[PDB]
Copies of this chain bind each other. A is one copy, B any other.
């Protein structure tokens, strides 16, 4: 058979698995081994977005699952354990396995049990693994996917950094950024209408202070999976080009491309060389996914500028929106305080500050000053202070026509922003009221609910 280098030699190796976005070290090995893999399924609530909880089903406690790294020709003894707290049974299908179900039948595992099967890794490449338990779509949509790398016998070329990034589409009963513990929504899933499309299982998993890092000059390899369940990723890097893209274990390698399609359940290895400092955005270039549903990740490059290659500034909230900042933890706090019944004005102000970036500042500015005659000010705005209910209606329904603000005429259009949730509108408005010599006070989510319901 291809990839057959004999029986395993040396000692049995207990595989070291890593959580995203990190990868285990190169196998660095000239002989085939028996590799023992132990993976445990855990079902648990985590934050899919700030103040938004979801019950994930995970291989190893993360979405995506633990990264597994072996060598072509290895004999893999795969142990799957299903944690006693689990409610569902689970199993695994690994792409790149040669045999029925990729492991599915022999890895079937009830809560509190363990299963094992053995396989030879005949096929070199980067491969998706996922759960394979009826209803399969439900399991994958709850986060049951990861990557396994089968290295070529001589290993991969050395690089300065290796990272692990995995897209997934998610289906919540609530709309995007609607707070609370969100159930899985089977209707949306059957219709291929995700509420969130994410890298590494949460909004902002790889933005701000959780960005990936490298330096000018260094090479970076990214192992990129698409767990689906349903979407095909127009996978793209903003501001750069991939030196190489290779799908699965495929013999073809594409070079110098910026945009590449990754099928549902597909995987690729991309190589990137850092040339100038700043933030490079990994996105699904089906744009509403990247900018309205959470499908963005940051590779942040540090080092000397090169004005002869690029004279411009680092990314900011104009493009990246509220993810230009280090985090939006103020939103989490304000949500937790709402639940507990201890929500203060300052909680709301801090949450609104986080949310105002991009969403409002793109026209009104970060300091609320506007641009005279073009964008009216929110700083010390007579128009705002004059009527706070009207301000709620402007955010929800937009505004057009001639207005006067601080003694100057505006005649333009503010688009409606109806997708904002009640709490986001309330927090943003509360931030504005308490900034820039505005009169203070607060707007509550419940005030916004009433205005939204009014015909």
**CB within 8 Å of B: which residues of A?**
1, 75, 87-89, 91, 93, 95-108, 110-112, 117-120, 122-125, 127-128, 132-138, 140-141, 186, 189-193, 228-232, 234, 236, 238-241, 247-252, 254-261, 263-266, 275-276, 278-281, 285-293, 307-319, 321, 358-359, 362-363, 371, 374-375, 412-413, 415-416, 418-419
Query: Smallest Cβ distance from A30 to chain B, in angstroms?
Result: 21
- Decide: A133 near B309, CB < 8 A? Known: A232-B232, A232-B234: no
Query: Smallest Cβ distance from A103 to chain B, in angstroms?
Result: 6
Q: Is B286 in contact with A264, judged by CB distance below 8 angstroms?
A: yes
Q: Is A374 in contact with B111, judged by CB distance below 8 angstroms?
A: yes
In whole angstroms, how far apart are the Cα atoms of A325 and B24 in the complex? 41
Known: A100-B279, A117-B310; 14 extra A-B contacts, CB below 8 A, are: A93-B319, A98-B309, A100-B276, A101-B312, A110-B371, A117-B311, A117-B312, A120-B309, A123-B241, A229-B287, A230-B286, A230-B289, A250-B257, A263-B285
Among A107, A137, A141, A193, max chain B CB count under 10 A is at A137
7 A-B pairs (CB sep. < 8 Å): A1-B309, A101-B312, A105-B313, A106-B311, A248-B257, A260-B263, A264-B285
Q: Is A256 in contact with B263, judged by CB distance below 8 angstroms?
A: no
In whole angstroms, how far apart are the Cα atoms of A310 and B321 in the complex? 49
Query: Smallest Cβ distance from A67 to chain B, in angstroms?
Result: 18
Can you name the residue of chain B whose Cβ is closest to the Cβ of A186? B419
Q: Is A106 in contact with B309, judged by CB distance below 8 angstroms?
A: no
Query: Smallest Cβ distance from A155 to chain B, in angstroms?
Result: 18
Question: Which of chain B's residues have a CB closer than 8 A to the CB of A241?
Answer: 96, 98, 123, 249
3 A-B pairs with least C-beta separation: A99-B310, A100-B278, A106-B312
Question: Which of chain B's residues have a CB closer than 8 A to the CB of A260?
Answer: 263
- Decide: A287 near B265, CB < 8 A? Known: A309-B98, A374-B110: yes
Question: Which of chain B's residues have a CB closer than 8 A to the CB of A75?
Answer: 308
- Decide: A239 near B98, CB < 8 A? Known: A254-B250, A257-B248, A319-B132: yes
Q: Is B251 in contact with A254, judged by CB distance below 8 angstroms?
A: yes
Query: Smallest Cβ distance from A250 to chain B, in angstroms?
Result: 5
- Decide: A87 near B412, CB < 8 A? Known: A286-B230, A318-B108: yes
Query: Smallest Cβ distance from A40 to chain B, in angstroms?
Result: 17
Among A100, A122, A255, max chain B CB count under 10 A is at A100
Q: Is B412 in contact with A101, judged by CB distance below 8 angstroms?
A: no
